[PDB]
Structure formats: structure tokens, C-alpha cells
A paper describes a structure:
In the structure of WT_Gal, one Gal was found at subsite −1, taking a 4C1 chair conformation with α-anomeric conformation of the C-1 hydroxyl group (data not shown). The binding mode of Gal−1 is almost the same as that in E208Q_Gal3, but the C-1 hydroxyl group in the axial position forms hydrogen bonds with Gly228 and Gln263. Comparison of the Gal-bond structure (i.e. WT_Gal) with the Gal3-bond structure (i.e. E208Q_Gal3) showed that the fluctuations of Glu(Gln)208, Asn179, and Thr226 of E208Q_Gal3 were smaller than these in WT_Gal. Therefore, it can be inferred that these residues recognize the ligands at the plus subsites. The catalytic acid, Glu208, has two major conformations in WT and WT_Gal. Thus, the movement of this residue appears to be important for catalysis. Asp158 of WT and E208A_Gal3 show greater vibration than WT_Gal and E208Q_Gal3. The role of Asp158 is thought to be a pKa modulator; therefore, its function and conformational stability might be related.
Numbering used by the authors: 22 to 448
The structure:
């Protein structure tokens, strides 16, 4: 089973996974994924969900880890974001931290809850401002010293100043500032310790819109920290995502991000990629389809076959576009609204296959494209805004192919313009 960024992910019961703003905890060889339940299409608090898996693909929904409490700061009128859980060895206790806020983000607190088992349910113990100052986007990092010292990483002072501060021995309170990046406008933080060095991954502040996420490193959490560098090509806006959790994996890591859909928040998707450290620093591997070997601490990227859209057969009013951002320097434009392209001679062993559509969409809103395989009934594929007419991203579609040769037609029947199609990759 494969990790396929941007698809609609469902749990073992077949229900949409609702765990945005991910926090991960490993117990044994089980991964616990905590997140925000947005099934109600709202930024206000419904639950902190809890899912488990052995392989980072096949997730079983457990009891919710945190439920709202009326008349408190975790009421259903309030905001609970970006939950994180670490285990406290001294107390044999799981401690959850989260961003605790009002609906207009004017309160800027953390909240804390505890449990004796990983999915809890957890008992909320209150919300507070760390050292009396704002905390909005946050994460928690647990170091590998004998004391397992933990730290809050947080956007402070109306998001302008990024802070790292040490937690007490219970992981209940922030008690000393460790470093601050004044004017850094960083949010969505996480830290992975790799080769003895601390690596901070963070986004800048653009609300729900994605932006180029950055890495910084230091030999001490007190700094000095290096200046920001990109984890992905800047035009792609972190391949249309925002950092949520950075999970170590052998000699590398896994980038776990959210693709926020602010007009329909429960349909926000999950963008998980290998975070390769072979250059000495974290770089996203743009892997449409990949898997993890947990015991070996490795990842494997699926190989596919590319087909350029411009080499297909156009029908109707579609055109050939030229641009440096496209594979082959070309793409097919004016798709939909009477224009089609058919990609022929797609060889396959048949059955269900992931097919990545590489496209550009310069609008600020989603487009979509109809897809028919071998003349079968049409499906509709969402095409998010890509960041520019010359900026290509990819979305996955799990198509049923025939054993042998296949033809795939794009854009038939739809009155709206689809995105511009650069190529497809058949896995
Ligand atoms: C497929 O994409 C089209 C746009 O290419 C969507 O049509 C837009 O729908 C919104 C409503 O969310 C309207 O406000 C816009 O005026 C429409 N734009 C155009 C150009 O028609 C359509 O909703 C998408 N289909 C699905 C199922 O999401
Ligand atoms: C998915 O997880 C469930 C629960 O542990 C397990 O019973 C099932 O076999 C898993 N599916 C696959 C394909 O391994
Ligand atoms: C948390 O630590 C700060 C800094 O020492 C202190 O001012 C505050 O009173 C502490 N909070 C609690 C609940 O002990
Ligand atoms: O207005 C519709 C047009 O939008 C452009 O962004 C696109 O490059 C064209 O191929 C066509 O779809
Ligand atoms: O404010 C809306 C939204 O803004 C950013 O995307 C933050 O990283 C999210 O956690 C959320 O707070
Ligand atoms: Ca192309």
C-alpha cells in the first residue's frame, strides 16, 4: 500500500480521514496520528482524532483523543489546532499540547491535556499564554538527552516573532525562553534532530494559502540558527502544502503537510513526502506514490512511465502551450469547453493504477478535468490552483486500466476550462 499525496484518504472503515494539523507519536511500532477533525467544514473545535497504523498507509480510527467541553476554552465555539503528543517517562503519561484560541485568533494560547494511554481519551487541564506571551501555531519537540527535555516551538507576538522555549519536567508548563527569531513571521513549525543537529521546518505567514516552507539548523536550540533555505522549489509553494509534522525515518525523515481547502475545510488533503537528508539538509522528494519500510527505516519511490500531453491527439479547440515550467517545454491548453486531448498507447498490466496528472492552473480557485479510460464512463479530477500558468504541480487519480494498451481522454463534456495538462505519469 502506498502514500499518495493529495488523494482522498479513507480509514479502514472507509470513512474520510479527519486529522489535519498532524501530530505523530510512535509507541512500539505503531504510529498514532492525532489531528483536527474537520468533518463539519469548520475551523471551530469538533475533536482531536486518533488514528493508528503499522505502515503509515492503512489507518484505523480509534476513539477521539480530545472532545469539546462547553463553557471552557475548548468549547465548540473555540479553536483547537495542531495537536502534538509526547510521552513523559517520569510520570508514565502522554501529554498533548495544542494551539488554543478564539474564533478570531485573538486569544493566542496553548492548551494541555493528559492521558495514560496513547489515544486516551485525554483530560484537558487548561489553556495559557507561554510566559504571558502569544502562542498561535505551535509544535512540541522532545530531545534525545537522558532527561528527554521537551520544548515548545511557537509563533508569538501576533505571529511576528518565532520562539523556542523549554518545558518543565512534567511537560505541563513553559518555563524558560531558549531562542527567538524576531521578525521572522514563521508558523507551522516542526523540528527533526538529524546527525546531532536541530533542523527547524516552518512556513511563513499567509493564512490558509500555501507558501515556500523553509529549513533552519543549529547545534543548540538556543541558536545561532542558519538563515532560511527552501525545502522545495519555491514556485510550487511546498508542492501546495503547509508543514504539519516532520517525522524521523532512518537516516532521513518524512514531511507531513496539509493542503488546506478553506472553502471546504473537511476536504483539506494530506501531502506526505520523503524528506531526503542526503545533501546534509532536508529536501522534499516530490514522490507521487511511495512507501515506507518501517523496520529498515527506509522509503521507496514508485517508478512510473511518463507521457507528454502535447504528444497526444488533440480534439476540438485545445491548443499547444509553450513554457519553461513544463516537461518538454510544452503543455496542452484550452482543455475542456470543447477541447480534448487523448493519450494513446499507455501500456499497463491493468487493474487499479495511480496516474499522476501534471498540470498548471494560474487561477486562484480550483479547476477540474474529466477523464475517460478506453471510452469508459467519465470521472472528474480536481485541479487545485498551482501558483501560476508556468508552475506545474500534480494530483493523483486511481484509474482502472486494461491489461495491454490503453487510451485516456481528457476534457470531454465539461463546459468549464480544465487546467493546462503538461504530462501524466502512470504508476
Ligand atoms: C470544476 O471546476 C469549475 C471551475 O473550472 C468549478 O466551477 C466554478 O464553481 C464555482 C463554485 O464553487 C463558481 O463560483 C464558479 O463561477 C465556477 N467557475 C467556472 C469557471 O465555471 C466547478 O464547481 C468544479 N466542479 C466541482 C465538482 O468542484
Ligand atoms: C489494515 O489494518 C487492519 C487493522 O490492524 C488489519 O486488520 C488489516 O489487515 C490491514 N490491511 C492490510 C491490507 O494490511
Ligand atoms: C509557568 O511558568 C512560568 C514561568 O516560570 C510561571 O510564571 C507560571 O506561573 C507557571 N505556571 C504555572 C501554572 O505554574
Ligand atoms: O481562460 C481559460 C484559459 O486559461 C488560461 O489560464 C489557460 O492557460 C488556457 O489554456 C485556458 O484554459
Ligand atoms: O488561521 C487559519 C490557519 O492559518 C494557518 O494556515 C495556520 O498554520 C493554521 O493552523 C490556521 O490557524
Ligand atoms: Ca509536457
Amino acid at each position: 500500500n502506498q502514500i499518495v499525496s493529495g488523494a482522498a484518504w479513507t480509514d479502514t472503515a472507509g470513512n474520510t480521514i479527519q486529522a489535519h494539523g498532524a501530530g505523530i507519536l510512535q509507541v512500539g511500532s505503531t504510529f498514532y496520528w492525532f489531528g483536527e477533525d474537520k468533518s463539519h467544514n469548520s475551523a471551530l473545535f469538533k475533536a482531536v482524532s486518533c488514528y493508528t497504523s503499522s505502515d503509515l498507509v492503512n489507518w484505523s480510527r480509534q476513539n477521539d483523543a480530545l472532545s469539546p467541553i462547553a463553557g471552557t476554552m475548548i468549547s465548540t465555539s473555540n479553536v483547537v489546532e495542531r495537536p502534538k503528543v509526547i510521552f513523559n517517562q517520569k510520570n508514565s503519561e502522554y501529554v498533548m499540547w495544542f494551539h488554543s484560541d478564539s474564533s478570531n485568533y485573538g486569544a493566542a494560547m496553548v492548551g494541555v491535556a493528559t492521558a495514560k494511554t496513547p489515544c486516551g481519551p485525554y483530560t484537558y487541564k487548561g489553556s495559557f499564554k507561554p510566559l504571558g506571551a502569544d502562542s498561535r501555531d505551535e509544535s512540541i519537540f522532545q530531545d534525545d538527552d537522558s532527561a528527554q527535555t521537551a520544548y515548545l516551538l511557537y509563533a508569538s507576538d501576533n505571529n511576528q516573532n518565532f520562539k523556542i522555549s523549554r518545558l518543565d519536567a512534567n511537560y505541563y508548563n513553559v518555563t524558560a525562553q531558549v531562542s527567538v527569531m524576531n521578525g521572522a513571521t514563521l508558523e507551522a513549525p516542526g523540528i527533526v534532530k538529524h546527525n546531532g543537529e536541530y533542523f527547524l521546518i516552518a512556513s511563513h505567514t499567509s493564512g490558509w494559502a500555501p507558501n515556500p516552507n523553509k529549513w533552519f539548523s543549529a547545534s543548540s536550540l538556543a541558536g545561532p540558527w542558519s538563515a532560511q533555505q527552501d525545502i522545495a522549489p519555491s514556485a510550487t509553494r511546498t508542492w501546495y502544502s503547509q508543514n504539519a509534522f516532520d517525522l524521523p525515518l532512518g537516516s532521513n525523515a518524512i514531511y507531513m503537510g496539509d493542503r488546506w481547502r478553506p472553502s471546504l475545510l473537511g476536504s483539506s488533503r494530506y501531502i506526505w513526502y520523503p524528506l531526503d537528508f542526503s545533501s546534509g539538509a532536508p529536501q522534499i522528494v516530490h514522490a507521487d506514490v511511495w512507501s515506507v519500510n518501517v523496520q529498515a527505516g527506509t522509503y521507496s519511490v514508485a517508478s512510473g512511465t511518463s507521457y507528454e500531453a502535447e504528444n497526444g491527439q488533440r480534439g476540438g479547440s485545445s491548443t499547444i502551450l509553450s513554457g519553461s515550467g513544463f516537461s518538454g517545454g510544452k503543455a496542452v491548453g484550452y482543455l475542456g469547453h470543447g477541447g480534448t486531448v487523448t493519450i494513446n498507447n499507455v501500456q499497463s498490466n491493468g487493474g487499479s493504477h495511480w496516474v499522476a496528472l501534471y498540470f498548471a492552473n494560474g487561477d486562484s480557485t480550483y479547476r477540474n478535468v474529466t477523464v475517460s479510460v478506453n471510452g469508459g464512463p467519465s470521472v472528474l479530477v480536481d485541479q487545485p490552483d498551482s501558483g501560476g500558468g508556468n508552475v506545474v504541480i500534480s494530483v493523483p487519480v486511481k484509474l482502472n486500466l486494461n491489461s495491454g494498451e490503453n487510451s485516456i481522454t481528457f476534457g470531454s463534456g465539461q463546459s468549464n476550462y480544465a487546467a493546462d495538462l503538461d504530462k501524466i505519469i502512470v504508476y
